[model samples]
Target: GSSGSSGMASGQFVNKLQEEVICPICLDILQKPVTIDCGHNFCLKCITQIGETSCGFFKCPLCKTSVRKNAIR
Candidate 1:
């Protein structure tokens, strides 16, 4: 009796989860997702470019947490 409601809710959850994985810089779904020391996730290329802009010091675009270039992984 309740099966239809459960499936509908799960599908909506999946869509929301997908939205969370998008890279802020690229505004696209993350490719090569990497987690920095601050525990924020970003596309590897996006973070690398940001690191360069700061001259090797980087901050998470979302949380503004300071991160070192070497700390990204």
Candidate 2:
């Protein structure tokens, strides 16, 4: 009979989203939050910097979702 005493680090994460933020592509905390119907929440800087500032269309940086310029609100 062979038995090995195993020691494994559970390494459980006990903390929640204390600095909860999104927009996975940038891998950053939420900043300049803005809600849009095109897909999900996006920061003002991200959305603006991501696409047509003076154009009438844009897409999400990650799984790009297309929408009219005015649609981003």
Candidate 3:
């Protein structure tokens, strides 16, 4: 939905949300969060190293479901 009538106010709200979401990979605050196909967010470098070498393709650490790195959102 379109963010209310005030665009400026909406921008502030977005900035706040960005601060709250934690990166699944880094296990810390997400500096630059990237969403994967599985609807999870993580730091680019952290995720890259975890499921490295493509062991049957990395799976979601939370759900253990098969995932495709290329499918990152």
Candidate number with the higher lDDT (1 or 3): 1
Best by lDDT: 1
Q: Model 1, which residues run further than 4 Å from truth?
A: 1-20, 71-73
Q: TM-score of the candidate numbered 1?
A: 0.52
lDDT per residue as tens, model 3, 1-73: 5565544443433334544767755568777786667777778667767755666367777777667657336
Between prediction 1 and prediction 2, the one with superior TM-score is 1
Candidate 2, which segments miss by more than 4 Å at Cα? 1-19, 52-56, 62-65, 71-73
Task: Return whichever of 1 and 2 wins on lDDT.
Answer: 1
What TM-score fits each model?
0.52, 0.48, 0.52
lDDT to native, each model: 0.70, 0.63, 0.66
> How far out, in Å, is residue 23 in model 1?
0.8
State the displacement of the C-alpha of residue 17, model 1, in Å, after optimal TM-score superposition: 10
| Candidate order by decreasing lDDT | 1, 3, 2
Q: Model 3: residues >4 Å from true position, as ranges?
A: 1-18, 71-73
Write down the worst ten-residue block by lDDT for model 1: 7-16
lDDT of 2 by residue, 1-73 (tens): 7876867676666766566776665656767666554557777767777775556466655556765656426
